[PDB]
Design an enzyme around this catalytic site. Structure first.
Site, mmCIF file in Angstrom:
data_model
loop_
_atom_site.group_PDB
_atom_site.id
_atom_site.type_symbol
_atom_site.label_atom_id
_atom_site.label_comp_id
_atom_site.label_asym_id
_atom_site.label_seq_id
_atom_site.Cartn_x
_atom_site.Cartn_y
_atom_site.Cartn_z
ATOM 1 N N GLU A 12 0.826 -1.189 0.000
ATOM 2 C CA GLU A 12 0.000 0.000 0.000
ATOM 3 C C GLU A 12 0.866 1.246 0.000
ATOM 4 O O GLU A 12 1.748 1.405 0.846
ATOM 5 C CB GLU A 12 -0.901 -0.023 1.234
ATOM 6 C CG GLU A 12 -1.536 -1.392 1.459
ATOM 7 C CD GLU A 12 -2.340 -1.477 2.739
ATOM 8 O OE1 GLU A 12 -1.779 -1.192 3.818
ATOM 9 O OE2 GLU A 12 -3.534 -1.840 2.665
ATOM 10 N N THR A 14 1.091 5.689 -0.478
ATOM 11 C CA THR A 14 0.485 6.834 0.193
ATOM 12 C C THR A 14 -0.899 7.128 -0.382
ATOM 13 O O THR A 14 -1.832 7.487 0.345
ATOM 14 C CB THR A 14 1.340 8.104 -0.007
ATOM 15 O OG1 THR A 14 2.692 7.849 0.398
ATOM 16 C CG2 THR A 14 0.775 9.261 0.812
ATOM 17 N N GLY A 16 -2.530 4.922 -3.043
ATOM 18 C CA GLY A 16 -3.327 3.780 -3.450
ATOM 19 C C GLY A 16 -2.603 2.457 -3.343
ATOM 20 O O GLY A 16 -1.407 2.408 -3.061
ATOM 21 N N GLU A 72 7.780 0.790 -13.705
ATOM 22 C CA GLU A 72 8.728 -0.276 -13.977
ATOM 23 C C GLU A 72 8.729 -1.021 -12.640
ATOM 24 O O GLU A 72 8.667 -0.391 -11.587
ATOM 25 C CB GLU A 72 10.115 0.317 -14.266
ATOM 26 C CG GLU A 72 11.210 -0.110 -13.303
ATOM 27 C CD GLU A 72 12.539 0.585 -13.564
ATOM 28 O OE1 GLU A 72 12.574 1.833 -13.582
ATOM 29 O OE2 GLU A 72 13.552 -0.119 -13.743
ATOM 30 N N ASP A 118 8.785 13.508 -0.115
ATOM 31 C CA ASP A 118 8.438 12.513 0.898
ATOM 32 C C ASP A 118 9.281 11.251 0.761
ATOM 33 O O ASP A 118 8.760 10.135 0.728
ATOM 34 C CB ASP A 118 6.941 12.172 0.825
ATOM 35 C CG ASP A 118 6.473 11.329 2.004
ATOM 36 O OD1 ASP A 118 7.019 11.498 3.116
ATOM 37 O OD2 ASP A 118 5.543 10.510 1.831
HETATM 38 C C1 LIG Z 1 4.011 -5.505 4.212
HETATM 39 N N1 LIG Z 1 4.909 -5.727 3.043
HETATM 40 C C2 LIG Z 1 4.295 -6.709 2.101
HETATM 41 C C3 LIG Z 1 5.294 -4.419 2.413
HETATM 42 C C4 LIG Z 1 6.621 -4.385 1.599
HETATM 43 O O1 LIG Z 1 7.320 -5.618 1.759
HETATM 44 C C5 LIG Z 1 6.445 -4.056 0.099
HETATM 45 O O2 LIG Z 1 7.530 -4.581 -0.729
HETATM 46 C C6 LIG Z 1 7.735 -4.168 -2.050
HETATM 47 C C7 LIG Z 1 8.005 -5.116 -3.073
HETATM 48 C C8 LIG Z 1 8.203 -4.688 -4.414
HETATM 49 C C9 LIG Z 1 8.121 -3.302 -4.743
HETATM 50 N N2 LIG Z 1 8.300 -2.761 -6.093
HETATM 51 C C10 LIG Z 1 7.879 -1.545 -6.743
HETATM 52 N N3 LIG Z 1 8.244 -1.371 -8.016
HETATM 53 C C11 LIG Z 1 7.858 -0.215 -8.626
HETATM 54 C C12 LIG Z 1 7.093 0.788 -7.938
HETATM 55 C C13 LIG Z 1 6.769 0.476 -6.585
HETATM 56 N N4 LIG Z 1 6.002 1.397 -5.785
HETATM 57 C C14 LIG Z 1 5.546 1.303 -4.407
HETATM 58 C C15 LIG Z 1 4.995 0.099 -3.897
HETATM 59 C C16 LIG Z 1 4.563 0.008 -2.568
HETATM 60 CL CL1 LIG Z 1 3.910 -1.508 -2.003
HETATM 61 C C17 LIG Z 1 4.666 1.120 -1.707
HETATM 62 C C18 LIG Z 1 5.213 2.333 -2.193
HETATM 63 C C19 LIG Z 1 5.656 2.425 -3.540
HETATM 64 CL CL2 LIG Z 1 6.339 3.939 -4.093
HETATM 65 N N5 LIG Z 1 7.176 -0.669 -6.034
HETATM 66 C C20 LIG Z 1 7.855 -2.359 -3.702
HETATM 67 C C21 LIG Z 1 7.659 -2.782 -2.377
#
Ligand SMILES: CN(C)C[C@@H](O)COc1ccc(Nc2nccc(Nc3cc(Cl)ccc3Cl)n2)cc1
Length: 287
Positions: A12, A14, A16, A72, A118
């Site tokens: 999740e 900030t 969506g 990406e 942020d």
């Molecule tokens: C509780 N737990 C599952 C949470 C963490 O592990 C969550 O682990 C991951 C695993 C893979 C990726 N890849 C990824 N790739 C491209 C954009 C992006 N954007 C994004 C995504 C989330 Cl979710 C929160 C904030 C942002 Cl800006 N994330 C990001 C987080």
């Protein structure tokens, strides 16, 4: 949203929920953010802000009262890596590589007058190659930074620059340098630098370590909207105590990234030229 097959929920953000998905037409694997006119133009313009250390915004899809941002895909965030390295700590060479790359990303965006505002471990993403990239760059300008996320989670204040906490309306690119400095310290010590749980707690934690700011170090600070003459006056602590065992080049850089005066705070470009990066390398991360 039509040519996208959801694989699983990644987490999740900030604004969506974010899913790992596959482009039903190109087979491309991406990170799909789903958010339930000026903002659209602003975000659409981000499709041209491309750099190796910035998570690429592939597309922006506005349909059915929902805004889809196609990114990406990266396999993990820095937060997870820091937690996994809690017992041993991230090797200094890798910390230096990540800081070096993040500064390149900031230097690029700032050159185009775009700021993040942020930055936090949750939006710094890494791959198995040793690269690290900044995600959500520019979304703050379009949507603003809320007190709570779309799921009501508290938006962290830990990396917030003092000028924002003191009520400055026009922040500068310096706000991101401050955040990155706090993240730098956290990677080194394996503990948040200023883990505040309210705006005043955040401000006082900063004051207790860096000293309560005054006109000497920050001209005009006493005239800021939220500045109060009744703020306790704490003395500045030696950085040798703040981030051991970081060497002098690292402490020098961190200190400049944490200058109170946004005008004195080192720029991303100047930071890249700092002696701390003289022996920078690109290690492959273990996890
Ligand atoms: C509780 N737990 C599952 C949470 C963490 O592990 C969550 O682990 C991951 C695993 C893979 C990726 N890849 C990824 N790739 C491209 C954009 C992006 N954007 C994004 C995504 C989330 Cl979710 C929160 C904030 C942002 Cl800006 N994330 C990001 C987080």
């Amino acid at each position: 949203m039509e040519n996208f097959q959801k694989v699983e929920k990644i987490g999740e953000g900030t604004y969506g929920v974010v899913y790992k998905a596959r482009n039903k037409l190109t087979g491309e694997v991406v990170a799909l953010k789903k958010i339930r006119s000026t903002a659209i133009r602003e975000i659409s313009l981000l499709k041209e802000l491309n750099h190796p250390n910035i998570v690429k915004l592939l597309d922006v899809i506005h349909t059915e009262n929902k805004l889809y941002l196609v990114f990406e895909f990266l396999h993990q965030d820095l937060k997870k890596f820091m937690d996994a390295s809690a017992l041993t700590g991230i090797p200094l060479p890798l910390i230096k590589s990540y800081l070096f790359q993040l500064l390149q990303g900031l230097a690029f965006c700032h050159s185009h007058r775009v700021l993040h505002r942020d930055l936090k471990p949750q939006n710094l993403l890494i791959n198995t190659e040793g690269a690290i990239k900044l995600a959500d760059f520019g979304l703050a300008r379009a949507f603003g930074v809320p007190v709570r996320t779309y799921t009501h989670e508290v938006v962290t204040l830990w990396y917030r620059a003092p000028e924002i906490l003191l009520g400055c309306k026009y922040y500068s690119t310096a706000v991101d340098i401050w955040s990155l400095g706090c993240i730098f310290a956290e990677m080194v010590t394996r503990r948040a630098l200023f883990p505040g749980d309210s705006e005043i707690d955040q401000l006082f934690r900063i004051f207790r370590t860096l000293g309560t700011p005054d006109e000497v170090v920050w001209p005009g600070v006493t005239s800021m909207p939220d500045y109060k003459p009744s703020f306790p006056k704490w003395a500045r602590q030696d950085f040798s105590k703040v981030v051991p065992p970081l060497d002098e080049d690292g402490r020098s850089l961190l200190s400049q990234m944490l200058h109170y005066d946004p005008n004195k705070r080192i720029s991303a470009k100047a930071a890249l030229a700092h002696p701390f990066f003289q022996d920078v390398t690109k290690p492959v991360p273990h996890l």
